[PDB]
């Protein structure tokens, strides 16, 4: 199993575990408070976003913390676990992205066209929109279910050489990762950026608190989700020749940093969306 040994120095695993525990407790408490408070249409989307953030925080954090930072080898949940973990992780990511984009759209309609938003808004339409968001999130993650699986990459077959990894052709992994990035990062990025820019322009041309909140939303989304997808593309595209030792170590250290920021995203979302403006 010397070909499946990831070299990660100590004093970094402890620090990343501490960061994960802090983010976990803070985000869980914040999302629980938000859900308790929420439980005519804003509350639906806020609750959906809080639920998605709590789901990605509880469901994907410990599995990664075990199998991907401390014990890289061997996979400790089998073939069903690998596929289920990756499918649910991608589903939560898509749900968060689409909830944020839909919240930006709803804010744009409420602020820039208040009279039309008063007539268009209804509980049934909001429920249908949330259901469509979740359906898209579930559907887009299906290709990842059939992409990940168990495979033996040791020196023969040995129990310690079984890893959870893409099990399809590299030319197909490139396509699936490009689809995931475009439908998880770039489209919500454009929607959020343009709509919050328009709203902030309208507010600046008369409340600066709202402009600051919108800017914080966009900047947080960028700085919390860009490195993750950059890392995934770096894994998928770089040829086998260029993956030297330095690049190999750098990938896993960058993995730690990127997952830290990605979970900080769900830690920060409830604060920016509910705990910054007055909630009573």
């Amino acid at each position: 199993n010397s070909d499946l040994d990831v070299n990660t120095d100590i004093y970094s695993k402890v620090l990343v575990t501490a960061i994960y525990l802090a983010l976990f407790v803070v985000g869980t408490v914040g999302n629980s408070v938000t859900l308790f408070t929420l439980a005519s249409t804003v509350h639906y989307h806020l609750g959906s976003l809080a639920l998605s953030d709590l789901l990605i925080l509880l469901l994907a954090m410990p599995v990664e913390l075990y199998n991907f930072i401390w014990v890289h080898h061997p996979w400790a949940f089998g073939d069903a676990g690998c596929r289920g973990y990756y499918f649910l992780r991608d589903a939560c990511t898509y749900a968060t992205a689409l909830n944020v984009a839909s919240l930006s759209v709803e804010r744009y309609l409420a602020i820039c066209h208040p009279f039309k938003a008063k007539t268009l808004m209804s509980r049934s339409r909001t429920k249908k929109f949330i259901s469509a968001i979740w359906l898209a999130s579930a559907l887009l993650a299906i290709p990842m279910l059939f992409t990940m699986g168990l495979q033996n990459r040791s020196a023969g077959t040995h129990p310690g050489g079984l890893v959870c990894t893409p099990i399809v052709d590299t030319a197909t992994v490139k396509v699936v990762i490009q689809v995931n990035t475009f439908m998880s990062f770039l489209f919500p990025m454009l929607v959020i950026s343009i709509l919050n820019t328009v709203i902030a322009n309208k507010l600046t041309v008369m409340l600066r608190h709202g402009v600051l909140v919108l800017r914080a939303v966009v900047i947080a989304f960028v700085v919390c989700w860009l490195p993750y997808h950059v890392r995934r593309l770096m894994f998928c595209y770089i040829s086998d020749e260029q993956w030297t030792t330095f690049l190999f170590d750098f990938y896993h250290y960058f993995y730690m940093l990127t997952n830290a920021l990605f979970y900080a995203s769900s830690a920060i979302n409830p604060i920016l969306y509910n705990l910054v403006s007055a909630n009573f």
Partner: peptide, 6 residues
Amino acid sequence: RRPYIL
């Protein structure tokens, strides 16, 4: 080598 973690 090649990382096996997506």
